[PDB]
Design a protein around this ligand. Structure first.
Ligand SMILES: [Zn+2]
Lengths: 109, 124, 589, 342
């Protein structure tokens, strides 16, 4: 977080609570955190894309392509409108055991 | 590892030695990086730094092939601005290049330079 | 433009005639006379008295310096003496310099080639920002300030104010920042560039070293703070701030259009002149260079050698004085020139040489006559433009004395306890044995002796002879570079030798606390570079020591040297009489 | 072009001065006992269009390229090649720089382009970032490349056309970067525009002007800046650089080692190249060229034949002088070829 403050973000969301980056809360090696830090304090506006892009695209280079638009409000009725930015690539093969029946060795029934 | 021909590292008996007779002595930045202690060893042994090897005997070429043991104090800056300290003992260019193969971080040249002018075939 | 207070920390206590000099200067300067000359020798605290006049006048001040060695020292001392007020520094931002000259006798054409620095242009832009942000500002500058520059009003028009909780669109702020030459660089954060991260923007000015976060909330500034760019240590926080351009030649687009039209006029005139002269190759080279530069900063804005077209930015006609740093100061400002005895003659000689090389360029197809107009200020236009002019030097300059009618103020007396050297005059011949005996007797103190000659041949003959009989000697030549005598300074502070010899490379920043005896050899002969000022300069160099001595050898005696010796002796007598009453030991603070 | 060679009016002897050679200002090589050589003395003149010829594999390449070009490259510009088996090169005080251009069939990867390896694309990005819009949008020259992840959209995957990218619509630039309309054009617009009509562009700015002007001097301004190497025919990969690799320090005796333009370009293209060579040799340049044709080296002023017979039957100089001089000698087949047609 000291390095993050040196870079400059002014936002953070850790341990389930949102803070400015200048305010680091308590952290422990035995404590588990779902770290989902904040990057900005913007909101929806007309013709504000040039703003919101600058909030997300650079984050795409730091969060490894992870960014959401969560409620950060009280009611939390829907789970953040399922808004985030079962599927698996795996590998393509038929004779190889990469993608065949692991038990029957890919042979016919 | 039979290669083409030995003596190919310094096969010139008439060039100006101060003008980089040996290929590592003529690099973009490593040129001076090796010329420093190689001229130091030339001054120590007693063969000239620029005179062609025909006014001098061929013993100059032979003694730059075999060189001598021990090390001397040496350090210089290159054109690129870096500062490398090649502090090692080399027995002439034949073992100096072998030291380059066994020491350098350039995994390409450490086998590029072996082929043209080093002949160490399988004895067994 | 708001007048502040010159909060000066002065732990040094004024002694004796210093207040008398200060209020004499006040009484002279309040009369409104355009010509003022002050005699302040080396070591007399000229910086302190100049700063005191600055405090009393409460006006922006411009200090005129002839070289980097004096200018940098004056700048750092003046910064130290004024904590709160933004003391400044303004010199050419080039370490290596090669002027574009054309020697016709040897047909040698030396082009524009330099070595850009990074720690001096930031100080220049700090100077401009402080000058046009607060009235209580002091700026010390070298001759590069009298070269081409931008107008103060146009550059001030681009300074933009900001505050916490104000209506400021991000797009407009970024456009204004880029228009004042701040390229938005994100991954790399360096001076002249700013980065953006989320709703925050990290900005670094062209004058300050610490970064600043400007945090927004929609189309409105949320807050502003300072931070260290690397360590991240919080210092302070402010509500309002102002931003300034990162180059000195910023103005409105219509001024760019007018400058372009003036460039077209100048290039047409030069092309016609070169076509009449028949110098096709030189005209072609000049035309390609001008097309390149003019088109590429018409499309971008930044180039090399834009100063040649600075006149076109200034809106002034040919032959008029180019806009300089004194225009930045208002008409109610104070200017002072330091070391004027070698600064004003330097101004004249440098203007002559630059105008000769500029004729050799423009006439022989290298630059437009606008480059001739882009020059150090000529003395006629200098007098036409300056106001209450104050001079300051170790010796009374003949030009200053003629301008002032001979009436001056003398403050060369040192309360610190410095006296002029003793004088011994001997014939040119029969001196080497005496010099050897004196150096053998004096070498127990391990000091240094400076000697001079006329030209190189017998000088080097003396050097190798005097290293032959058993003394370590060092010599100076006509092409002395910085390293070869900075190492001399290092090894003399290491005490590695005892004697230096030099002809002309001795008047520029070669200060040494342990030089007692100086020898002048056959300098009585006429010379454009060996008149009385060099002898008085060496006399003062010996004087700065606790106990100086000059050994002066002449075949013939001229009036200049004897009048200089007489005035030096009478000033030394006055200083001794003053110091006999001020017997307190020096107390530096 | 092949017909234009025979009915030339341009592939003629074109008699030069041939006296710009100098008895002292001249390079020599002796004692080269290479496996392909014998140890003969080759006398290279300076300030001329000297051409080294002979049967390939008889030692001409091992002497001119493996020995000479190697030594002047490694200790006259800063290269790394081994000198090889020889003894002497003279005129060290009369030489300043050397440039070697190989045959080099190297165009196979889409990454390599006639503007990317030449070192001009980075300067193009710098110039485009010098625009106000690129400054306000925070786009840097490195950001403004097409190989780094910053400037390439994931939809194209970097190739521009996959049916092209839906977002780019056949332009190979994302919308967040295409907004930079410097001089009314973008990078895609400049790349699409042909160099022949772009000769008026980049005229003020010096380096791109020099590159484009020398490319046009070659006469093949049909290529685009970002042309992928799979679409470039083998042989012309280094021609574009070789255009700018023929005038350094304007002395201009700086020696340039030339490959064979016969590989690829036909004799009319080689005669346009010859016009360029002759013009800048009159300016003062020096070229050492291994060649295969007849009239192109007949235009030259000095011919050196190394080895009449292939293999071990060569390795020795058999002629050195004016092309008509070697033509009169019934020993070098190069001269014999230059003699049957005059
Ligand atoms: Zn795309």
């Amino acid at each position: 977080f000291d390095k993050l403050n040196a870079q400059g973000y002014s936002r953070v969301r850790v341990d389930g609570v949102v803070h400015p980056l200048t305010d680091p809360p308590k952290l422990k090696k035995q404590e588990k955190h779902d770290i989902e830090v904040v990057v900005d304090r913007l909101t929806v506006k007309a013709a504000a894309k040039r703003r919101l892009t600058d909030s997300v695209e650079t984050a795409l280079n730091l969060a490894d392509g992870i960014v959401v638009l969560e409620f950060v409000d009280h009611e939390l009725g829907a789970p953040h409108r399922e808004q985030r930015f079962d599927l698996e690539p795996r590998s393509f093969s038929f004779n190889s055991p990469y993608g065949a029946c692991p038990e029957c060795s890919g042979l016919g029934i | 590892r039979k290669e083409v021909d030995p003596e190919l590292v310094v096969p010139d008996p008439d060039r100006t030695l101060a003008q980089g007779a040996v290929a590592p002595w003529s690099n973009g930045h490593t040129a001076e990086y090796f010329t420093r202690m190689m001229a130091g060893l030339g001054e120590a042994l007693g063969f000239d730094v620029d005179t062609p090897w025909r006014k001098l005997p061929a013993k100059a070429r032979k003694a730059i092939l075999e060189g001598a043991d021990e090390q001397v104090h040496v350090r210089y800056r290159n054109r690129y601005g870096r500062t490398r300290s090649y502090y090692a003992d080399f027995e002439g260019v034949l073992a100096f290049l072998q030291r380059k193969m066994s020491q350098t971080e350039s995994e390409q040249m450490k086998e590029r330079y072996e082929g043209f002018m080093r002949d160490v075939p399988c004895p067994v | 433009r708001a007048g502040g207070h010159f909060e000066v920390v002065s732990p040094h206590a004024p002694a004796g005639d210093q207040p008398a000099a200060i209020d004499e200067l006040e009484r002279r300067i309040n009369a409104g006379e355009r010509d003022v000359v002050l005699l302040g020798a080396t070591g007399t605290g000229k910086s302190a008295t100049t700063a005191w006049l600055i405090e009393r006048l409460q006006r922006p001040t411009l200090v005129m310096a002839p070289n980097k060695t004096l200018a940098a020292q004056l700048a750092n001392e003046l910064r130290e003496m004024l904590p709160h007020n933004a003391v400044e520094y303004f010199v050419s931002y080039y370490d290596y310099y090669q002027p574009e000259a054309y020697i016709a006798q040897t047909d040698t054409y030396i082009e524009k080639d330099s070595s850009i620095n990074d720690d001096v242009e930031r100080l220049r832009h700090s100077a401009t920002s402080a000058l046009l942000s607060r009235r209580d500002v002091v700026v010390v500058a070298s001759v590069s300030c009298i070269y081409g520059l931008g107008t103060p009003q146009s550059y001030l028009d681009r300074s933009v104010e900001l505050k916490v909780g104000e209506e400021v669109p991000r797009d407009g702020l970024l456009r204004l920042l880029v228009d004042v030459q701040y390229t938005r660089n994100d991954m790399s954060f360096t001076r002249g560039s700013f980065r953006v991260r989320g709703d925050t923007v990290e900005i670094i000015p062209s004058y300050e070293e610490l970064a600043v976060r400007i945090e927004f909330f929609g189309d409105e500034i949320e807050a502003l703070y300072y931070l260290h760019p690397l360590t991240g240590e919080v210092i302070r926080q402010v509500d309002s701030l102002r931003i300034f351009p990162a180059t000195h030649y910023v103005a409105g687009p219509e001024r760019m259009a007018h400058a372009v039209s003036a460039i077209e006029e100048e290039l047409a005139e030069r092309l016609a002149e070169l076509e009449s002269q028949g110098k096709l190759l030189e005209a072609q080279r000049l035309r390609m260079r001008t097309n390149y530069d003019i088109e590429m900063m018409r499309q971008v804005g930044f180039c090399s050698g834009i100063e040649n077209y600075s006149r076109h930015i200034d809106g002034r006609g040919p032959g008029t004085p180019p806009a300089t740093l004194l225009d930045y100061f208002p008409e109610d400002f104070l200017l002072v020139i330091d070391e004027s005895h070698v600064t004003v003659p330097q101004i004249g000689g440098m203007y002559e040489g630059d105008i000769s090389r500029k004729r050799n360029l423009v006439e022989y197809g290298f630059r437009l006559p606008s480059a001739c107009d882009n020059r150090p200020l000529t003395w006629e236009e200098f007098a036409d433009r300056i106001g209450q002019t104050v001079y300051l030097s170790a010796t009374p300059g003949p030009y200053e004395l003629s301008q002032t009618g001979g009436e001056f103020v003398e403050q060369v007396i040192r309360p610190t306890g410095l006296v002029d050297p003793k004088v011994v005059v001997k014939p040119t011949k029969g001196q080497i044995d005496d010099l050897i005996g004196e150096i053998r007797t004096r070498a127990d103190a391990d000091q240094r002796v400076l000697v001079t000659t006329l030209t190189k041949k017998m000088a080097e003959d003396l050097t190798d002879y005097l290293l032959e009989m058993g003394i370590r000697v060092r010599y100076l030549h006509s092409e002395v570079d910085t390293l070869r005598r900075v190492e001399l300074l290092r090894q003399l502070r290491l005490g590695d030798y005892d004697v230096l010899v030099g002809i002309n490379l001795l008047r520029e920043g070669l200060d040494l606390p342990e030089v007692s005896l100086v020898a002048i050899l056959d300098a009585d002969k006429e010379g454009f570079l060996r008149s009385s000022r060099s002898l008085i300069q060496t006399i003062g160099r010996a004087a700065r020591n606790v106990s100086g001595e000059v050994h002066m050898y002449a075949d013939k005696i001229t009036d200049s040297m004897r009048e200089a010796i007489d005035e030096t002796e009478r000033r030394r007598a006055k200083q001794i009489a003053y110091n006999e009453a001020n017997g307190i030991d020096p107390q530096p603070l | 072009i092949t017909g234009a060679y025979l009915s030339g009016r341009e592939s003629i002897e074109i008699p030069a001065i041939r006296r710009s050679v100098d008895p002292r200002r001249q390079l020599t090589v002796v004692g080269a006992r290479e496996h392909n050589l014998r140890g003969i003395d080759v006398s290279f003149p300076l300030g001329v269009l000297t051409s080294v010829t002979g049967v390939s594999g008889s030692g001409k390449s091992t002497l001119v390229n493996d020995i000479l070009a190697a030594v002047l490259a490694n200790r006259l510009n800063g290269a790394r090649q081994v000198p090889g088996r020889h003894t002497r090169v003279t005129g060290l005080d009369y030489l300043d720089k050397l440039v070697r251009v190989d045959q080099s069939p190297i165009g196979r990867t889409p990454r390599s382009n006639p503007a990317t390896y030449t070192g001009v694309f980075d300067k193009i990005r710098t110039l485009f970032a010098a625009t106000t819009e690129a400054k306000v949008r925070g786009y840097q020259p490195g950001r403004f490349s097409f190989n780094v992840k910053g400037g390439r959209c994931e939809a194209c995957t970097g190739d521009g056309t996959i049916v092209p990218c839906e977002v780019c619509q056949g332009a190979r630039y994302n919308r967040e970067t295409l907004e930079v309309h410097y001089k009314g054009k973008t990078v895609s617009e400049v790349l699409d525009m042909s160099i022949e009509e772009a000769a008026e562009f980049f005229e003020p700015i010096a380096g791109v002007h020099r590159y484009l002007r020398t490319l046009v001097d070659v006469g093949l301004g049909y290529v685009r800046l970002g042309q992928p190497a799979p679409t470039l025919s083998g042989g012309e990969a280094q021609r574009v650089k070789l255009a700018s690799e023929l005038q350094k320090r304007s002395t201009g005796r700086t020696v340039y080692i030339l490959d064979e333009p016969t590989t690829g370009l036909h004799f009319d293209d080689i005669r346009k190249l010859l016009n360029v060579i002759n013009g800048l040799v009159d300016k003062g340049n020096t070229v050492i060229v291994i060649e295969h044709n007849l009239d192109v080296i007949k235009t030259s002023d000095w011919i050196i034949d190394l080895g009449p017979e292939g293999g071990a039957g060569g390795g020795t100089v058999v002629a050195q002088g004016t092309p008509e001089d070697v033509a009169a000698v019934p020993a070098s087949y190069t001269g014999k070829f230059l003699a049957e047609v005059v």
